[PDB]
Every structure is written in C-alpha cells, then in structure tokens.
Symmetry: C3
Amino acid sequence: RTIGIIGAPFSKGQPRGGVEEGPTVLRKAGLLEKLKEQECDVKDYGDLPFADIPNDSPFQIVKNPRSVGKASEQLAGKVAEVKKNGRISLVLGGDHSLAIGSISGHARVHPDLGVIWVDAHTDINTPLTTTSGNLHGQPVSFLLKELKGKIPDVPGFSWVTPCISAKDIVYIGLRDVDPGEHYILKTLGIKYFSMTEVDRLGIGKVMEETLSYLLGRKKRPIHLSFDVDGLDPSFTPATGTPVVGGLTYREGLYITEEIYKTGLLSGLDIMEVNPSLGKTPEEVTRTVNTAVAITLACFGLAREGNHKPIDYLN
Amino acid sequence: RTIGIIGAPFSKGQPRGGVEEGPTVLRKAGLLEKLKEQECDVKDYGDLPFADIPNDSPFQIVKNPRSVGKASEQLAGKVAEVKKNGRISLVLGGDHSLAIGSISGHARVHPDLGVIWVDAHTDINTPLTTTSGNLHGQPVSFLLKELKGKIPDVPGFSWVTPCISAKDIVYIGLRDVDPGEHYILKTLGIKYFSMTEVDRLGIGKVMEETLSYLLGRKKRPIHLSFDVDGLDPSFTPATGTPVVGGLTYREGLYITEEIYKTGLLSGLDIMEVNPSLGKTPEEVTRTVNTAVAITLACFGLAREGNHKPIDYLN
Amino acid sequence: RTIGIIGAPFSKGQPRGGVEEGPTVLRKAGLLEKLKEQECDVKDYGDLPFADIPNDSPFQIVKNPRSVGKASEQLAGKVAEVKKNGRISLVLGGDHSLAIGSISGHARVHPDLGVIWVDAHTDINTPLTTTSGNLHGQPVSFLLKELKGKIPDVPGFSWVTPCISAKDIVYIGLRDVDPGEHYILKTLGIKYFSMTEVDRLGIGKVMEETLSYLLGRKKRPIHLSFDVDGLDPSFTPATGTPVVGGLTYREGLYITEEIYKTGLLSGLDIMEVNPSLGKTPEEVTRTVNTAVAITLACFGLAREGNHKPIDYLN
Ligand SMILES: N[C@@H](CCCC[B-](O)(O)O)C(=O)O
Ligand SMILES: N[C@@H](CCCC[B-](O)(O)O)C(=O)O
Ligand SMILES: N[C@@H](CCCC[B-](O)(O)O)C(=O)O
Ligand SMILES: [Co+2]
Ligand SMILES: [Co+2]
Ligand SMILES: [Co+2]
Ligand SMILES: [Co+2]
Ligand SMILES: [Co+2]
Ligand SMILES: [Co+2]
C-alpha cells in the first residue's frame, strides 16, 4: 500500500491549541518508520505551514472562520496532489475541522468516494445549529449536498462546494450528538451506528453492514475520518472532547483491519490527538500508541500476523 | 415520561451505613435537573424519613428485621401513592432490601407487573438459606409466591404478601450466587442471564429474549430493580458488594435504553450506591455519574441523540 | 472432577526468573483449598525440583536448551504418571516452554488428545525462525508432527517425539505473531481465532466452533495450555510478554466454563504468571486472582452458581 503523509498542525477549529502537536508526537513515535517496517511505500509531504490570520473575528457565533477555512482550503490542495500522485492521503492533523479540506481535496480526484466517520460525535452542526461555535464540530455540514442552502456564507469558506451526499457516509461510535444534529440525522436519512447499535449487533455485523451499505451498488474509493475520541478515553485520554462508553481498542483495530481488507481505502484522517491534555506522560503515550496502532492497521498490520510472500521454513 | 421520585435513605438491610447517602449525592449531581432537561415530567415526593427502631434484635441470623420490614412497608405505601398519581416511581435508595417494599407497593396498583433484576447477585436467600443475615440479599425471597411456605414469620414483615411468580422475573448480570440461591433458581425455573449468558449471546440478544420472555403473552407494566453492583466495579466502585467481571458501562446503558423503548417502564430502583466506600473522590463521582446516566437512559436519553418534535433547520 | 496438581517452578525458557514463583503464589492464594471447596478430588504431586545445569551454552541462538529440555522431559514424566492415576494434570508452571513436556507426557497416555492454546502468541517459532532464542516461544514447534524435519537436534530434546498434528490444535487470543510463525500458520492450515476473530464472532461462537472443530469426528481428551498473557494486561499485568487488546476477564472465564462443560478436560497448564513483574502489590494480586478464577472455572465453578445434589429448601 502506498501512502501520502501530510502533517496538519492546526487547532483553530476548537479552543485548545495542543492538537497542533499531533503531527509531531505521531511522527516521533516512529509512524513513518513503522509503516516502512511493513510493505508500505511512504512519501511524507511534510507538515502544512498554516500562516496566522491575526484578523479573524467571529462570524455570528462561529469562531476563527478565516483561519479554519484557509487551512482546509490549503489541505484540500495537498490532498488532491497526493491523490494525483496515486497515493493514499494520510492526514495527521489537529482538530477535526480539517476534515472539510481533506475530504474536499479527495473528492476532487475521486468524486465517487464513500465516507466512514468514526467519532463519538457527528460533527454535523451548521453555523446556525452549533452552540459552541467550534468548527471542529461542524465539518460534516459543509460537505453535505443536502445541506447546501442552510449553511451561511462564512468568511473563509467561499471555496467550498459540498461534495458528498447524505447517503455516501456512515457514522460509527456516536454517543454525544446535539439535538439539531440528531434532527439532521433522521431527516436526511444518514446511516449511522451509534454505541447502541454497536452494543446491539457487535462490531463485526456493524462493519459488515457499513461496508455493504457503502459498497453495495459498486466499489468506490473509501475515505476514513478517524476522530480519536471515538475510542473510549481509557484508550485515548489526550483528546479534547472525551466521552465515556467508547469503542474499545479492539473494536478500533477491528474497524481499520476490515477497512484495509477492502483494498479500497484511499483517504485517511487521524484527528484530535492532543498531548497537552494528558493527565500524565503515560496518558499521552497511551493515546499516541493507540493512534499509531490504528493507522498501521489501515495499511495492513493484522493481529493474526503478517508475512512476506516467501518460504520462511525454506 | 412522568416520574415520581422517592428518596429512600436506608441501610439496615446490610452492615455499611453510607448507602443512606444515596438520595443525597444522586440529587446533588443534578438528577432532577437532568430529567427536566429532557422531556420529563418530574415530581419529587421527598426522602422517606425512617425513624429509628432501637429495639431490633436478630431473628435467628436475620439482622435488623424490624427496621428493614418497616422501611419497606413505608416505601410500599409511597410507591403505591405515586403509581396512583399515574407516575413512574423512581426509588433512589440505600440497600437492596428496600426492593421488597418498592415492588410490593408497585404490584398493589399493577399486580400484573414484570420484573427485571439487574445485579451481580440474585438476592433470593431465605432467612434459612442466608449465611450473612443481611436482608439486602433476601428481598426476592419475600416476593415469590412459589416460596411462600418456606419463609419464616420474621418480625417486621407481617404486612408482606408475595406478589410475583417465579415466571414474572428475569435476572441479568449474575456472577456471585450462593448454593441455596442457585438451587432455588433451577428448582423454580427462574429465567436468568448470568454473565456467562451475556458473554455467550451478547447484550442485544439477552435483552431481546428478556423482553420477549416477559412481554410474550401480553404487554404488562415493567419494574426494573437496578443494583449498581451489577455493573463492573470499574464503573461503580462505591458499592458494598463489588464483583469483578460485571456488565460494562455500555451494556448498562443498552439495557436501560431498551427498557425505555418498551414504553412499559413503570417502576425503577437505583440501589446500593455507597459514597463512603469510594477509595477516592473520583471513585465516588464515577459511581454517581454512572448511576445518573443509567437513570436518564430509563427515561429517554439515547446515545444516538434526542430532539424535540420541531424543525431544527427551520 | 479429580485433579493432579504439579508445580513447575521453571524460567529458563525466557530471560526473567520470577516465573519460578508461580507455583508458590498460586498455592498460597488458596488454590488447593478453593478446589476442595468445590466437589474436587485433589492430589498435589508437589513442585518438581529442577536441578541446575550450569553448563548450558546457547545452541546457535536458542538459549538454555539443556535446562529447558530436561525440565520438560521431567515434567512429561510426572504428567504421564498423574494421567495414569486417572487424574487431570494441573501444571502450575513458570514459562510456557514447559508445555513441551506437559503435552508430551499427556499424549503418552492419551495420544488422541486435542489442544486448545490460549495465548497472545502462537509460540510456534522453530530454532531457526525464532529471533529471540527464548524457548517459551517455540514449544509448539517441537510438538507438531508436520514440522518434524525442520527442527534441528537441540541439546536437551533428544527425548522428544512430535505428538500432535496441525489439525488437532486451536489457538484463541492471538495478537502478536511473528512473520515466520504466521507463515507456519497458513501453510500447515492451523485453526486459530486471533483477537480479530473474537471481535468478529464473539467468544460464544469462537468457543462453539473451537469445540466443534476438535470434537467433530469423535470425543477426545482435551488439553488446555493457558498462557496468562492471552488475557489483557489490565487483568494479568504480572506477566513477561504483555500485549494490549487481550481477552477480557469475562472471555477468559467463558472459555474455561465452556471447556469444563465438555467434561473432556484432561490436561491444564497455567503459565507465565510472574509476580516480580508487577508494578504494584495489587498488580500481583490481580494477576494471581485472575489466574485462580480461571483455574476454578476449568473444574466447575460457574458464574450462574453451583449447588450440591441436595434439597436446599428441605
Ligand atoms: N457537538 C459539540 C462537540 C463536537 C466535538 C468535535 B469533534 O468531534 O471533532 O471532536 C460541538 O459542536 O461543539
Ligand atoms: N448473597 C450475599 C450477597 C448479596 C448482596 C446483596 B445485594 O445484591 O443487594 O448487594 C448475601 O446474601 O449476603
Ligand atoms: N514470539 C516471541 C514472544 C513469545 C512469547 C512466549 B509466551 O507466549 O509463552 O509468553 C518470541 O518468540 O520470543
Ligand atoms: Co469527536
Ligand atoms: Co470529530
Ligand atoms: Co448485588
Ligand atoms: Co442486590
Ligand atoms: Co504469550
Ligand atoms: Co505462551
């Protein structure tokens, strides 16, 4: 599998700025090295340099819209470039708002992509439904074609064009969804597997249906947006919006192992890892370690084992 | 959903007296407020004042029988009253012995009720089978019609009349059952799902069968007696009789979310929460928080989300 | 059920010597007493005294081959003796290398035995595939008939005769398998349920298939080799090779409860418990406690309860 690593040290989609350290701690944990330890072809396109936009007052309640909108616009470009290089874009980012540019850039090359959004949240608040104003909780609303007409023209996002339909996305792990967000869920008929469905069906059936749902009619490129708060904070504590009762370490690896096995993974986001929020140096390493393990699984690392195409017994 | 809150600060069903603080810490955690934050109609009937019965020597091995028997008799009355007010009785109690009065009072109004008992124990010891003498581990024996004839006339329980049949109760979560208790299980043919069955079937199937079992022939009012030690102590540590290998936070919420969805919940007990037993201030908050989350789920709070009947996108 | 307890304080199959304390801490936790508390017939054949083999240089990369080979040869003899006494051999050991002698001795009496290997590892490295040289990670390679011809004549194992076929063994819990080990897995067609399969099917189906797999054609004696690192280190931290994402306390007990229920358990190993590796006195007790609970389950202790064949209500 050939990857296109892209560091995205951004945080203006939410209050806490430690998420910008994401690319740093992840790379320093040997991610690139570990990918190469596998049969992975890796090209690191570096960390995107997000220049400061000192003048960026709120748009109504929406915070740092110009900074956010510009970082996603830039990202979208780098992603598109890697997708043109015939590589799977791996976005080691800051907050989840970056998803807007990652998915957008991906769709430019493969407009028929299907999205898997693992998160404890749906992040589909509109600028009028969000109560926090944090954009890392509204990325999905900017992308849905069905929602084009409700989203106001927010400074910094003029370049955006909704690229995915409500039927081309599956949510897995939900356990903290706002009222307006849930209204949108049921109204647009979005397919989701909240923690209740996971508990009911088991992660195997959940993944079986998710993949059947998105790859029913035909095979299409898959984009996986992975918010680390989708996993229980007993696994990923150094994250800004933890919610108890999350997916287990195992369920996290099962999800990714199944996605990889599709052979259709083409876009991947690893978001919301914030070292600064770790209560102890071990919570940080535990969060980073869990984050790396999930990434390796997306590119082939299997729990049952791996082996090159040779005769080990000779 | 309309609730009838009833505080039951009682502890004489067992040794440790910190359980009496149950109503206090639960209410102070905003339970009433959080219920109102939902579409819940709440009337708090206050904390029942249990006067001291200084003269209450053991009956054979059975401890504090008069104190226990009187608190359940009183409770039964308050429950019946709330059930007559057309409200779902919510009993924030002390020890599980109170179940005797809660279920009894409930049955007075709805004699056809079905019982779901979530606990790590079966609490069906008779005064002759119990080895500890603690009544919080014998409540079920006073209620079963099938057992009427074996239970001795214990001071304080003359007012009791067995109200439920062995076939109108399901156990979920069992992992610490005494020999005589197990003998009673198999002999009366009581339906139960111990941790082994949960592991075997999954919580979804367990709940599917539990509800099919109790609501097969017809729909009937449901009484949920929830002992917090049914959940693993990694979730509810501040409890008197913890047993490892318990139901998860998720399984706990799944159970309740499914019960609520029946629309038949009419009686609820939240028992054995003892702040005094928390090893740290966080074990207390973790136990209380888990206790509140389970209660909210019984009245509609869903992990996938909630929304009023309006147009959020306008 | 009648047991034949055998202490095996050995550690030369790996670096750390604290595993030799296994028999000691296990017995001192009341294991023999607790077995008797059940309807178990127990005869403790004592702790095998492994004399020092001061002169034992590496064989290529393989470490302490003579010490290891001799301890398994001795063990095999004691096991065979207990199996001749019509008792179920219970091997409280040190490292997993001892499996070589336990299974070998067992097969002498019941050559048709079936093996269940619960571990986070496959321990099927050959002296030429192992990279660590630690024999506790190669035991399975000495036993497989299919592998006879690749394994070099290692000092200390001249007495060995491969006793099991690749089709008479099931692995459960795998999550850290070496490349050569995985090559062997797929090539010999060994049946296994890694953590991925557990996640996919559930432990109930996994056990259903494992037992159907080994007891399909006919009923045969079952040998359970239980490496405590098969369970998540949140349960068994005092172990030499911990790997996160392991089987839960519940899954561990479910496995054993199901094996016991077969009535065919005839050989049992409880390996890799190392007190010296516990970060705190509680990690040690937690590891030992978990180890005892699993053993009791193999001999009848059920979570739903137990009761003698009498009338408890009289
Ligand atoms: N729904 C909340 C929290 C969303 C959290 C964003 B996320 O999932 O990216 O961490 C909000 O709108 O602020
Ligand atoms: N079976 C034990 C323990 C029962 C625990 C009571 B419970 O479930 O309410 O906490 C006894 O009879 O003392
Ligand atoms: N595969 C590694 C680790 C095996 C661990 C051995 B065991 O499972 O017994 O703990 C090795 O060969 O050194
Ligand atoms: Co999130
Ligand atoms: Co998110
Ligand atoms: Co209990
Ligand atoms: Co109870
Ligand atoms: Co192992
Ligand atoms: Co092993």
